[PDB]
Amino acid sequence: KLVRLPGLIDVHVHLREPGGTHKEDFASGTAAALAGGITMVCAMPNTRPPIIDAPALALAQKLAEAGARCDFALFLGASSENAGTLGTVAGSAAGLKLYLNETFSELRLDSVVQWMEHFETWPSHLPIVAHAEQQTVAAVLMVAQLTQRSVHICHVARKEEILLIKAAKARGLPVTCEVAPHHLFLSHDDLERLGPGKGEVRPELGSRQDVEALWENMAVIDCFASDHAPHTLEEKCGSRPPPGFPGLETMLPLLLTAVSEGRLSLDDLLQRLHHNPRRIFHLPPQEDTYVEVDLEHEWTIPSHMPFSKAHWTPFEGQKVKGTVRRVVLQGEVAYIDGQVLVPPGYGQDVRKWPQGAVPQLP
Amino acid sequence: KLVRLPGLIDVHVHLREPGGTHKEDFASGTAAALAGGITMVCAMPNTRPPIIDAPALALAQKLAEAGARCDFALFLGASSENAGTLGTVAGSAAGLKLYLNETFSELRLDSVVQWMEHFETWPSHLPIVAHAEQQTVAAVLMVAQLTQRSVHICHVARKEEILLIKAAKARGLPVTCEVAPHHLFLSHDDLERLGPGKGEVRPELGSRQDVEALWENMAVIDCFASDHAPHTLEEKCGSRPPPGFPGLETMLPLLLTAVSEGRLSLDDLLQRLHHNPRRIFHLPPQEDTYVEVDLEHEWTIPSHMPFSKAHWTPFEGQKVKGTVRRVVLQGEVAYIDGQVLVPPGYGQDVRKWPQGAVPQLP
Numbered sequence A, B: 001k002l003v004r005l006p007g008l009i010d011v012h013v014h015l016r017e018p019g020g021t022h023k024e025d026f027a028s029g030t031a032a033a034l035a036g037g038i039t040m041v042c043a044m045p046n047t048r049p050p051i052i053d054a055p056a057l058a059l060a061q062k063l064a065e066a067g068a069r070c071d072f073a074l075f076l077g078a079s080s081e082n083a084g085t086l087g088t089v090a091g092s093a094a095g096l097k098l099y100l101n102e103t104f105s106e107l108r109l110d111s112v113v114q115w116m117e118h119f120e121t122w123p124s125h126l127p128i129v130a131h132a133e134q135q136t137v138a139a140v141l142m143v144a145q146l147t148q149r150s151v152h153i154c155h156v157a158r159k160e161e162i163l164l165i166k167a168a169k170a171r172g173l174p175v176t177c178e179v180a181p182h183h184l185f186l187s188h189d190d191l192e193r194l195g196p197g198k199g200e201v202r203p204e205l206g207s208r209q210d211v212e213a214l215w216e217n218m219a220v221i222d223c224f225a226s227d228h229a230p231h232t233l234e235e236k237c238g239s240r241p242p243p244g245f246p247g248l249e250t251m252l253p254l255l256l257t258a259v260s261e262g263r264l265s266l267d268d269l270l271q272r273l274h275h276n277p278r279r280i281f282h283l284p285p286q287e288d289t290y291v292e293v294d295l296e297h298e299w300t301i302p303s304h305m306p307f308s309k310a311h312w313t314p315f316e317g318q319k320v321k322g323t324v325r326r327v328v329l330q331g332e333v334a335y336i337d338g339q340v341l342v343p344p345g346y347g348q349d350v351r352k353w354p355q356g357a358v359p360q361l362p
């Protein structure tokens, strides 16, 4: 007996097109999404060229419309030069992404004043998300309060961060957050197995106490999001390993395993992979779209999942219970038992649908 | 220039059919909903007969399918005799409603043990909502914790109640709540104008400090819901006035006025009348459904709104800014500038749609 789920949404993926297509492209990354039970993805802007201006967004839209197999929205990225210049295209994006720490990106902001300028100029009704670790969470929350608007914190990874967000929510501040599966299911204890190259990720893997704190504070976590960050094995194990893990194909099986163990409920999962992504990002419904999972099937994660071009996974060897059997997208069978059945280009930009625009005052 | 909103959802209405159809019926109450920009309603079970058993639910389903002009779900009601008997029909309902205080209902529970029995027997994945005032909020929260599940608190009306819920959320407890417009826009100061009959409502109108506390704690309020509770003027002003206000036609204009004044944002409104109702009750999307509002139009609420059979309103004389111009439901024009254009029976039971079932473990 299969369980029917709505179409799940991952608000944090790196699909590497343009410019990094040996790592992933729209076609391979959205195949990975479908095989993970994900029917909508929000793609980050740290591509080559980065999606920091109208011409780059126009290019990315066409590459996505031609390559994506599931539906999508594209983030814009904040830069040191583009505040006040994105108003005409802002509403066509998933939101604005701020890179506030060191990671796999060149979108460097050198001053909190630049953060303030983005918060002041980006339309107030549209989402802002931030890569903000440790004290940077508190710093970006201050900027959000000074500018009287909301912020969403990407991949919360530490006890310190979840407790700070908890305290902010207790004060009624408009902050939401997401957590990635590696920060729930891996820790410092896995670094010996992974080694120092494969283990590179930002935020870094946390201690057992960090992991435990995230689980204990599940009520504070609004979304799960993979931070699917594919790089090839050669890159991960070479002389300058880039940070990041692939994760679209493993996220739902890991979480279903936790549901089966009673660590969270099916509802808790659906809030975090469907309803809260929709409401934070004003993402539209997908007609005739659903996912069928088999909660009884036990398997062990192999050395690489079938679709991501990363061709490796840090979850190798973990025993899971639960698998995606079938995905129906927009009335067509998109995935069945390892076979993707929709071509590149089947997916659409949800921000172009009338129901996908973010409502605003005239 | 009109603003397009998604189809709004009211999770707390009394449509009076069966058995009270001089007050309202499915056809008139759903006309009122559409004119208020509401495209989906969840109807309470305190009808005559009350919806407390499978035969009564079957009757109500047919009356709703024949009379409703917008989409709907029907609550079941808890009684002193039905715990453990609703399992086969529970999934077809909006949820289970517990009447835990004195109000317009006979669904009396005489012991907290009966509350526990309902929480133990009702399927754990399906919604439970409660009329629970003052200390009853804390009491039902205890029952929910003892039985390890969630609860939703109907029409929170007091500083005491919102602060208790705030404290429970700070402790990570699974509780949500809604607030009705009369508890945001009326107070003890209006009782002289209303008089003691018209002014009867449960929960009663609060003090200015209660109203202020609800606004100050907007972050704690998950939903707005009208508690549309129509009674005729003769009944309200006669020898034994029943409690309740009609409210479908006035709720959105009152809230749009507040948005225009900067008291909450358009997003805050859409979370509370669309996204959070969807996620708490697992209510499905409505295809090709939207509401167009004119945020500039100033008007004064008259002595009765056009559609509700109540034929009176406690908001008479209040100046508002914002009005519903057009509603499209399921691809058809349902309402335009005072004219309802879909017949009784156009609306459907969302729990019968494949996407409207609440997901559960096998």
Ligand SMILES: O=C1C[C@@H](C(=O)O)NC(=O)N1
Residues within 6 Å of the ligand: A014, A046, A103, A104, A105, A131, A200, A201, A202, A203, A229, A230, A242, A243, A244, A245
């Ligand atoms: O912030 C980031 C971005 C990402 C990437 O590789 O794009 N990888 C990471 O590990 N952290």
Ligand SMILES: O=C1C[C@@H](C(=O)O)NC(=O)N1
Residues within 6 Å of the ligand: B014, B046, B103, B104, B105, B131, B200, B201, B202, B203, B229, B230, B242, B243, B244, B245
């Ligand atoms: O709890 C309730 C129910 C309602 C009704 O009239 O049905 N009216 C009220 O004032 N309170």
Ligand SMILES: [Zn+2]
Residues within 6 Å of the ligand: A064, A065, A066, A345, A346, A347, A348, A349
């Ligand atoms: Zn396309």
Ligand SMILES: [Zn+2]
Residues within 6 Å of the ligand: A103, A131, A154, A155, A202, A203
């Ligand atoms: Zn990041």
Ligand SMILES: [Zn+2]
Residues within 6 Å of the ligand: A012, A013, A014, A044, A227, A229
């Ligand atoms: Zn990322």
Ligand SMILES: [Zn+2]
Residues within 6 Å of the ligand: A278, A279, A282, A283, B270, B275
């Ligand atoms: Zn929305």
Ligand SMILES: [Zn+2]
Residues within 6 Å of the ligand: B064, B065, B066, B345, B346, B347, B348, B349
């Ligand atoms: Zn019908």
Ligand SMILES: [Zn+2]
Residues within 6 Å of the ligand: B103, B131, B154, B155, B202, B203
């Ligand atoms: Zn009530």
Ligand SMILES: [Zn+2]
Residues within 6 Å of the ligand: B012, B013, B014, B044, B227, B229
């Ligand atoms: Zn009621």
Ligand SMILES: [Zn+2]
Residues within 6 Å of the ligand: A270, A275, B278, B279, B282, B283
């Ligand atoms: Zn749901």
